[PDB]
Structure formats: C-alpha cells, structure tokens
Amino acid sequence: PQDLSEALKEATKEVHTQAENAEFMRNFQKGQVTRDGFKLVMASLYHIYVALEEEIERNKESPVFAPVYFPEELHRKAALEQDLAFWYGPRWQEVIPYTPAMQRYVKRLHEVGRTEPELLVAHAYTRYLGDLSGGQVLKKIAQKALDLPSSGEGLAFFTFPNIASATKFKQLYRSRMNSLEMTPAVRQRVIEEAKTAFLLNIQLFEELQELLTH
Numbered sequence: 001p002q003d004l005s006e007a008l009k010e011a012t013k014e015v016h017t018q019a020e021n022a023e024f025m026r027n028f029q030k031g032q033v034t035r036d037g038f039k040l041v042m043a044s045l046y047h048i049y050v051a052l053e054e055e056i057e058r059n060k061e062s063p064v065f066a067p068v069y070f071p072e073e074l075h076r077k078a079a080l081e082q083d084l085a086f087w088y089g090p091r092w093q094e095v096i097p098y099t100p101a102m103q104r105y106v107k108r109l110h111e112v113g114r115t116e117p118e119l120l121v122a123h124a125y126t127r128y129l130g131d132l133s134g135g136q137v138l139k140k141i142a143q144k145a146l147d148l149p150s151s152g153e154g155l156a157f158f159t160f161p162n163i164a165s166a167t168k169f170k171q172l173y174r175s176r177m178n179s180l181e182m183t184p185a186v187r188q189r190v191i192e193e194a195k196t197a198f199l200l201n202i203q204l205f206e207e208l209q210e211l212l213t214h
C-alpha cells in the first residue's frame with residue numbers, strides 16, 4: 001500500500017507467520033523456556049540493540065532517519081545492560097555468548113547504518129515496534145516460567161517506561177515512517193530490508209533452538 005507503514009506490514013506478513021511458527025517461539029508461548037534459553041535471547045537482543053542504536057546515533061541527524069528518531073521513548077540498550085548484569089552477573093559483558101546468527105544480524109545492522117542509512121528505518125521498525133507490541137506479553141510468560149527472586153531486576157527490557165500507551169506511540173511512529181521522503185527505488189529497498197530483518201530474526205531463533213538442544 002501507498003503508506004510505508006502499511007507497505008511494510010503487507011510485505012512482512014508471510015515472514016511474520018514464519019516467526020510465529022518458529023520452534024523457540026512455539027515453546028516460549030507455552031512457557032517452555034528455561035533460564036539458559038531466556039539468557040540466550042537476552043544476550044542476542046543486547047548485541048542486536050548495541051549495533052542498531054549505535055547506527056541510529058550515527059544517522060540521527062540525517063533526513064533518512066531523523067523523523068523516526070525517538071531515543072527516549074524506545075532505546076533498549078541501557079535496559080538490556082541492567083538485565084544482563086542480573087542474568088549473567090558482574091562479569092556479564094565478558095561471559096555472554098556471541099554466536100554466528102547474532103554476528104550476521106549485527107553485521108547487517110552495521111552495513112546498513114554505515115553504507116545504506118536510508119534502510120535503517122526497516123530495522124528500527126522490525127526491532128522497536130515488534131518489541132513494543134509483545135513486550136508485556138513476553139514479560140508475563142517469562143515471569144510465570146522463570147520463577148525469579150524478589151530482586152527487582154532482569155526484565156527492564158520488556159517495559160518501555162517513556163511510552164504510556166503502545167497504540168498511541170505506534171500510530172505516531174507509523175506516521176513518522178510515512179513522513180519519510182524517498183524515491184521509488186529506495187522505497188522498494190526499504191521493503192526488502194524489512195523482510196531481511198525478519199529473516200535475520202528467524203535465522204537467529206532457529207540457531208538458538210539448535211544450541212539449546214542440547
């Protein structure tokens with residue numbers, strides 16, 4: 001559809017279904033996640049968000065990203081550092097895994113941010129709006145399954161404290177995505193990058209599932 005927000009949703013409809021069907025996702029939705037499995041995901045998300053939010057800061061002024069620049073409402077790096085310190089302890093940054101599928105995702109993020117900053121919106125869309133939509137649902141599953149201590153730590157990633165209403169912000173973010181000035185050629189590449197982003201997520205959760213058994 002003419003609006004980029006609708007165009008991205010239509011284009012990634014099929015790959016989103018693939019993600020829903022993914023083995024780890026099937027297991028998680030039924031509360032079959034272990035602490036090691038959950039730690040593995042938190043570690044992955046950290047690496048992904050470090051790369052993404054590094055590239056966002058590099059391209060925050062540029063007309064190709066500036067309209068969708070919402071650091072205070074969306075940034076997840078700081079929250080993930082807080083959570084990993086709980087999950088992996090004081091030595092978290094030394095001991096956290098960095099696997100091929102994490103590397104490939106991080107690699108693509110840096111490639112986009114450095115050489116194709118016009119497509120960064122596709123990765124920011126895929127990460128932020130996805131994580132915002134499922135944040136509280138995924139948290140509630142994690143709370144039930146993982147049986148945490150009363151330490152008040154470990155799940156900061158799943159709350160966006162500067163977004164009171166997810167629907168309110170998502171409507172604003174979509175409008176800002178639609179406000180982006182781009183040529184027909186760039187627009188098509190943005191669409192393709194969104195599918196690539198979804199596929200990098202699918203490839204990641206497939207790898208994580210493979211690593212968990214055993």
Ligand code: HEM
Pocket residue numbers: 005009016019020021025026029125126127129130131133134170197198201202
């Ligand atoms: C168990 C797997 C998953 C389920 C059940 C699921 C389900 C959902 C649901 C119910 C929504 C809210 C619908 C809406 O109002 O837009 C949503 C949003 C979204 N999800 Fe997922 N999802 C899954 C995995 C993923 C993955 C791996 C990604 C890739 C990063 C992803 C990306 C997104 C995006 C970008 C949105 C926002 C769509 C929009 O509003 O334009 N999802 N998802």
Ligand SMILES: O=C(CCc1ccccc1)Cn1cncn1
Pocket residue numbers: 028041129130131132133134135138
């Ligand atoms: O799936 C999402 C983040 C990946 C993840 C999966 C399981 C546990 C923690 C984190 C966000 N999302 C996208 N659509 C709905 N939710």
